[PDB]
mmCIF file of all heavy atoms in Angstrom:
data_model
loop_
_atom_site.group_PDB
_atom_site.id
_atom_site.type_symbol
_atom_site.label_atom_id
_atom_site.label_comp_id
_atom_site.label_asym_id
_atom_site.label_seq_id
_atom_site.Cartn_x
_atom_site.Cartn_y
_atom_site.Cartn_z
ATOM 1 N N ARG A 41 -10.960 9.507 12.635
ATOM 2 C CA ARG A 41 -11.064 8.123 12.142
ATOM 3 C C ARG A 41 -12.533 7.794 12.016
ATOM 4 O O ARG A 41 -13.169 7.217 12.897
ATOM 5 C CB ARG A 41 -10.303 7.203 13.091
ATOM 6 C CG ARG A 41 -10.515 5.732 12.790
ATOM 7 C CD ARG A 41 -9.653 5.313 11.663
ATOM 8 N NE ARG A 41 -9.845 3.901 11.332
ATOM 9 C CZ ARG A 41 -10.856 3.467 10.601
ATOM 10 N NH1 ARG A 41 -11.787 4.274 10.125
ATOM 11 N NH2 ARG A 41 -10.959 2.164 10.341
ATOM 12 N N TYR A 43 -16.028 6.737 9.244
ATOM 13 C CA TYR A 43 -16.569 5.977 8.134
ATOM 14 C C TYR A 43 -16.356 6.629 6.770
ATOM 15 O O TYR A 43 -16.392 5.934 5.762
ATOM 16 C CB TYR A 43 -18.094 5.857 8.353
ATOM 17 C CG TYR A 43 -18.774 7.213 8.097
ATOM 18 C CD1 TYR A 43 -19.391 7.502 6.907
ATOM 19 C CD2 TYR A 43 -18.759 8.208 9.083
ATOM 20 C CE1 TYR A 43 -19.993 8.710 6.671
ATOM 21 C CE2 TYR A 43 -19.327 9.433 8.865
ATOM 22 C CZ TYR A 43 -19.932 9.682 7.651
ATOM 23 O OH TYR A 43 -20.515 10.926 7.448
ATOM 24 N N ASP A 46 -11.090 6.410 5.757
ATOM 25 C CA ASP A 46 -10.225 6.498 6.896
ATOM 26 C C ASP A 46 -8.920 7.118 6.430
ATOM 27 O O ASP A 46 -8.238 6.528 5.599
ATOM 28 C CB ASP A 46 -9.971 5.092 7.446
ATOM 29 C CG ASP A 46 -8.882 5.097 8.529
ATOM 30 O OD1 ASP A 46 -8.410 6.164 8.986
ATOM 31 O OD2 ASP A 46 -8.471 3.979 8.900
ATOM 32 N N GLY B 45 -5.833 -4.834 5.775
ATOM 33 C CA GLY B 45 -6.185 -4.768 7.156
ATOM 34 C C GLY B 45 -7.106 -3.621 7.427
ATOM 35 O O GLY B 45 -6.767 -2.466 7.179
ATOM 36 N N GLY B 46 -8.296 -3.913 7.948
ATOM 37 C CA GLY B 46 -9.188 -2.902 8.399
ATOM 38 C C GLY B 46 -9.938 -2.195 7.298
ATOM 39 O O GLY B 46 -10.696 -1.248 7.593
ATOM 40 N N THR B 48 -12.848 -1.456 4.528
ATOM 41 C CA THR B 48 -14.256 -1.803 4.431
ATOM 42 C C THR B 48 -14.976 -1.453 3.145
ATOM 43 O O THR B 48 -16.137 -1.880 2.976
ATOM 44 C CB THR B 48 -15.036 -1.067 5.544
ATOM 45 O OG1 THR B 48 -14.733 0.299 5.438
ATOM 46 C CG2 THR B 48 -14.591 -1.530 6.909
#
Side-chain angles (χ1 to χ4, degrees):
Chain A
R41 171 81 181 80
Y43 72 99
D46 170 11
Chain B
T48 55

